[PDB]
Amino acid sequence: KDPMSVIKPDMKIKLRMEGAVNGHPFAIEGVGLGKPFEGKQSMDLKVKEGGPLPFAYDILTTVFNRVFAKYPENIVDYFKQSFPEGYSWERSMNYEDGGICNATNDITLDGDCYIYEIRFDGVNFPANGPVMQKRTVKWEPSTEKLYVRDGVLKGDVNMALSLEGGGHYRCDFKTTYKAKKVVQLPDYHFVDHHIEIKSHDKDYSNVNLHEHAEAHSEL
Amino acid sequence: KDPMSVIKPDMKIKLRMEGAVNGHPFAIEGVGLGKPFEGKQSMDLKVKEGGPLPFAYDILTTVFNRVFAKYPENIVDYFKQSFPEGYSWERSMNYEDGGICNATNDITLDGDCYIYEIRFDGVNFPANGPVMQKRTVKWEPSTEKLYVRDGVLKGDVNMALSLEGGGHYRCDFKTTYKAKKVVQLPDYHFVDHHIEIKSHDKDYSNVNLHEHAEAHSE
Amino acid sequence: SVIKPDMKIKLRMEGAVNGHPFAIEGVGLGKPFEGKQSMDLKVKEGGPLPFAYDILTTVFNRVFAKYPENIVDYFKQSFPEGYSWERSMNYEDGGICNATNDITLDGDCYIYEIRFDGVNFPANGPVMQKRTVKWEPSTEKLYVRDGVLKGDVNMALSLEGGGHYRCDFKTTYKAKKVVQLPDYHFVDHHIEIKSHDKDYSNVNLHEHAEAHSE
Amino acid sequence: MSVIKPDMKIKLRMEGAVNGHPFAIEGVGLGKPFEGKQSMDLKVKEGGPLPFAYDILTTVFNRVFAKYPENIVDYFKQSFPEGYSWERSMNYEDGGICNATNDITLDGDCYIYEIRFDGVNFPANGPVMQKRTVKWEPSTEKLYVRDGVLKGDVNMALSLEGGGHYRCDFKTTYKAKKVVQLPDYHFVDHHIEIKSHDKDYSNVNLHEHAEAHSE
């Protein structure tokens, strides 16, 4: 029952994402591992259906768990607290050219392995835009702002994807986090994050993805 | 194959929607009938999975085919002209309290039946908002603005749900329409529409839905 | 102590909406430690205004926010030298307004020099058709970036028929002297046109604002 | 098409502000409307030396000087003698935003522009206030009619000193002074260059060429 009895310095990850972009369905499975207290993780992802993906893989990567964030003692850690029962999140990602991606993740724990059930649905990406033409290169490191609204935990961030050449293509993230049991809610705070595709094959059928994240009381 | 030879004044509809709202999955199947040249249709919808639905059914009704719109002679009818091959659409529905629904429909034709494969995904509806509390009454009649930008047919409209107690709840609709084959694009125009839930049982597991729609040049 | 319990306001705004120029002058009074103010505004040029007056009201001074003792007050610290701000207001239908205010202090009066420029409001939209009612009370988020203070808020204008028309506000505030920079904090505010004549030639405008930490 | 000659002149005044600091610039130029080419010389009158990248101003300093093939309706040449106006938002990737307007009139063989320019929220360390921009990449404006109104969108990019780009989303609304036949959707290629300037940009020679196309 104690959340600190169902977590270890090293935890495993398994996931499946089912999704569509502009109405074209795809599926991806992942196997990974991370260090919840260091706030680091990595995973290998394989496209199972709908490959070669006709859009920029970067729209997916922030969808592939804030348990993997380093929380100082002085900030309530909603995510580590939620276990063993787990938590879910919902997110809209509203891109500056009108592309919008909705995603959800239901995170459970069995043994030492977090299990993700992910849904991803993106619409209205212009054929000529950086997503459909695969001209993206990386997410700039940024800072999520976490706060409680009407009794739930929210996360907002203005994100920026670096392009070929590159300059930046902007996206507004709005996340809602919901523990499955009643967990003590934190005060407003911040989570720095840095996500990287470390390697991939030509059409991103195979991707090795890394992230690290750290919570803080100020920006 | 002339698009007018694969359509009749009376056509049938079959559909399946698979979806989720705030991460909770559901599925609905529909059978309907419509008069494409009158711009009228109705259908009966049955929840197959995820009932009783915990959200306002009205968020779904506009996702449950512009074939059922009356087009005057001076406006190119992209929708009827896309058959027999058919067409698809993608839409974002951005509600005023931050709730956002994305939807798609892939529309094919088998005999005198249109067949829809629909996906619906809504996120970030607050628990105390009119959608999750089922405080919506109807979509106000409105007018979709159609236009062509960068070789693609689009439709925009600022829709509004009436609420119980008298308020309104606004939603920005942005649709992109794509024919399976290359079809002549129209010039900008408008589609007036009126959508109604004519009957439903208590938990909306059964719903009878009507729409009528008419294109004009204005 | 250059900030008194009762302070006056004089202002001039020059601006344009969709390329059509106008000018407005204001005189007012406020209680900076109580976080309230009111003013009377008069259209001097470009009247009758062909657009919703509500787009202007948040442009017509965070010194009139009540700050508790445990939150660093960037604005009150800035006087006698004062401060300036610039802001973009990006409406959901693509209308965008840019505004600036340069704020000085002359004895007992704050003096505002304001510029306001709005473009791309559709003729058929709520702004050009004057279908807005009021701004909903909301909370600005204030935080430091690059030695200067920022304020962001997702604002909502209620419309005549019920619903809301949204606008993202992004403000940069710049003190004219070195002050202590605050930690992240919030400002609740409530703005209300208390009276106006039919074409808004004359407007009485009220605000109250309060900073908080949580 | 008789109030428009193969050789036309240009006169303009821009009044504006960036981050609250006002400035004013005047310009005199010449162009070939049917060849889609123009140039002008521009002089800073107030607010010099300008403390921001001149490049933010250059696309504000007239689609009459775009070469239109016969098969695309030319909204701009059709506007005259009465003329037209435009309004535009330029939303840069770091949050800096510039709004601009131009009212274009015709006096004999000379187009006259009344321009307003206002930019806010350019960060002190960014490429605009640090004057680290080099030139606008050649791009293509996408023109379309929505709800009876002619609009143009383009994702523009400035190349930066030392490499890379700084992006900007342009959204323009065009408005003829009289009822003019609306075109179908189409594209305008453009290339804009500062060909010469002095050290502080008090003097600038600016060239543009633009061509409309289908597809």
From TrEMBL, chain C:
This is Fluorescent protein Dronpa. SUPFAM superfamilies: GFP-like. Cu(2+) 1 binds at residue 196. The modification Phenylalanine amide is found at residue 60. Belongs to the GFP family. Keywords: Chromophore, Luminescence, Metal-binding, Photoprotein. GO terms for biological process: bioluminescence; generation of precursor metabolites and energy. One of its GO terms (molecular function) is identical protein binding. InterPro entries: GFP (IPR009017), GFP-related (IPR011584), Green_fluorescent_prot (IPR000786). The lineage of its organism: Eukaryota, Metazoa, Cnidaria, Anthozoa, Hexacorallia. Cu(2+) 2 binds at residues 206, 208. The keyword Isomerase does not apply. The keyword Metal-binding applies.
